[PDB]
């Protein structure tokens, strides 16, 4: 009996399972109470339980193990852990842990962690032998993360133009600058699909902050990877909470020498949240943002880097512009020169229903010479020189046509000669 085995299957399986186990009507309870009562009644038969979850530090000293079913929040099935385990086995926020668990004992209300078996997909014996995040030596991206599928499907174009507009690498810092209703969602979905297909070794995670529930439920079953989200049903406290959860998970995983890739949507919602949960410090500028209200977005974004010993943390967030409110603009303003790679989507191109609507020369990547080879770089320069004198819209159409004629970009490059 593992926690994830009830964590991932839908509510219907839980219903039939509890109705089989001779339960009070479980349809009256929440998913977390469903799993809680089922694990209760299972342990009441005399089984030792196993479980897993991501740790969250509390200010009282003890920690709590959350799951991705609750999007890393407080729930009845969260596993309590004493501070002394956090001491001995060197635990902290982001450390995903799986091991021996039991239901809350007599008078308690949360599961207890008995025996640690896996710390961030590692032996708990070597978990103490880890390197911190701030002591890391960041670098530029050297390894290329090819986004092209090569099968030549209809939507795959929106990926190939990636390899032609703004290259990506392990540990890249990317900002999506686009007005609302321009095509950021399909772009992000294709990004996630291409990464999960071509690079299944690196862990893939996605942030949805203040989004619509339909987008969340479509995302959680379109990508091959564990996704976390937070709609507008919930206060910004939930958004900042899941923000620490995901960022510390990525930090601990990259400390374990793993390549993490986070796709955040959108950074404007996260900035609004961080501004509304931060108290007033008397420092107000245009838009209604506190001066220290942006320190947390700056932290979350500067978390991205390329480690030298092994592993990297790529952070690709989308920002919203042209939303009519100057506050949003100011956000994008401080995020203007902070990223070394940008995807600029103009609404003028998306207005003609020609996708993908990407502004070529307004997009680019800093220090992209270390991500690609010499032939590829020269061909990129030639393509930029060919596309520069023309405008945005039908020039993007020209790129789309030249991409649709060839199967992969090798034929396109050879034809460009």
């Amino acid at each position: 009996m593992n926690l994830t085995e009830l964590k991932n299957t839908p509510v219907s399986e839980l219903i039939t399972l509890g109705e089989n186990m001779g339960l009070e009507n479980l349809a009256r309870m929440r998913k977390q109470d469903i799993i809680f009562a089922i694990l209760k009644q299972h342990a009441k038969s005399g089984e030792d339980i196993f479980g897993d979850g991501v740790l969250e530090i509390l200010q009282d000293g003890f920690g709590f193990l959350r799951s991705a079913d609750s999007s890393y929040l407080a729930g009845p099935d969260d596993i309590y852990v004493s501070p002394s385990q956090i001491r001995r086995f060197n635990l902290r926020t982001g450390d995903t842990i799986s091991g021996k668990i039991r239901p809350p004992k007599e008078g308690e209300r949360y599961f207890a962690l008995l025996k640690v078996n896996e710390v961030n997909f590692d032996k708990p014996e070597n978990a103490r032998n880890k390197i911190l995040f701030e002591n890391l030596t960041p670098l530029h991206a050297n390894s290329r993360l090819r986004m092209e599928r090569g099968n030549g499907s209809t939507e795959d174009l929106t990926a190939r133009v990636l390899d032609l507009a703004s290259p990506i690498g392990r540990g890249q810092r990317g900002l999506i600058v686009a007005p609302p209703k321009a095509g950021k969602t399909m772009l992000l979905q294709n990004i996630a699909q291409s990464i999960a297909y071509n690079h299944p070794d690196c862990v893939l995670m996605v942030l949805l902050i203040d989004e619509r529930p339909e987008e969340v439920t479509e995302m959680q079953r379109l990508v091959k990877g564990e996704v976390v989200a937070s709609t507008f049903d919930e206060p910004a406290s939930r958004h900042v909470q899941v923000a620490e959860m995901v960022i510390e998970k990525a930090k601990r995983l990259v400390e374990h020498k793993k390549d993490v890739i986070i796709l955040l949507d959108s950074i404007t919602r996260l900035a609004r949240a961080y501004n509304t949960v931060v108290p007033a410090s008397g420092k107000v500028l245009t838009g209604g943002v506190d001066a220290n209200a942006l320190h947390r977005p700056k932290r979350f974004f500067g978390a991205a880097r390329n480690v030298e010993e092994g592993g990297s943390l790529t952070i690709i967030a989308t920002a919203l512009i042209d939303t009519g409110s100057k506050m949003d603009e100011v956000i994008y303003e401080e995020f203007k020169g902070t990223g070394n790679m940008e995807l600029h989507l103009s609404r003028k191109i998306a207005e003609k229903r020609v996708f993908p609507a990407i502004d070529y020369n307004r997009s680019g990547t800093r220090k992209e010479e270390l991500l690609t080879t010499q032939e590829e770089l020269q061909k990129m320069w030639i393509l930029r020189k060919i596309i520069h004198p023309m405008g945005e819209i039908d020039a993007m159409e020209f790129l789309i046509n030249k991409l649709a004629m060839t199967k992969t970009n090798d034929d396109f490059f050879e034809m460009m000669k």
Partner: protein, 112 residues
């Protein structure tokens, strides 16, 4: 032999009494009779969190047991320095030191 006798000090001043007795030992150049402080307050137990993750090098009873050779001059020296209110041990005034089992026990508490 350098035995490990136990000494009690003023409540809170354990480390201060430790440094005072060390300066007293280095004062009368009697290092051949004493060892070190062996302050057993290896209790790095801390409370971490939002902008507050400092450590606590405290949380231990007020005992500063010192390794030393029991003698008249040694006892009068460790008692001459003030804030030495407690000299534990069942005796008139010349107690028995601790055994090697508790020595290794407190050593394990030091290492852990």
């Amino acid at each position: 032999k350098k035995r490990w006798y136990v000494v009690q000090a003023f409540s809170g001043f354990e480390g201060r009494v430790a440094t005072s007795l060390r300066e007293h030992i280095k004062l009368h150049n009697m290092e051949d009779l004493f060892g070190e402080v062996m302050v057993p307050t290896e209790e790095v137990v801390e409370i971490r969190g939002g902008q507050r993750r400092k450590s606590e090098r405290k949380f231990f009873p007020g005992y500063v047991l010192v390794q030393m050779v029991m003698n008249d001059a040694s006892w009068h020296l460790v008692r001459s320095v003030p804030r030495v209110m407690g000299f534990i041990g069942g005796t008139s005034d010349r107690p028995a030191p601790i055994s090697d089992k508790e020595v290794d026990a407190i050593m394990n508490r030091l290492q852990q």
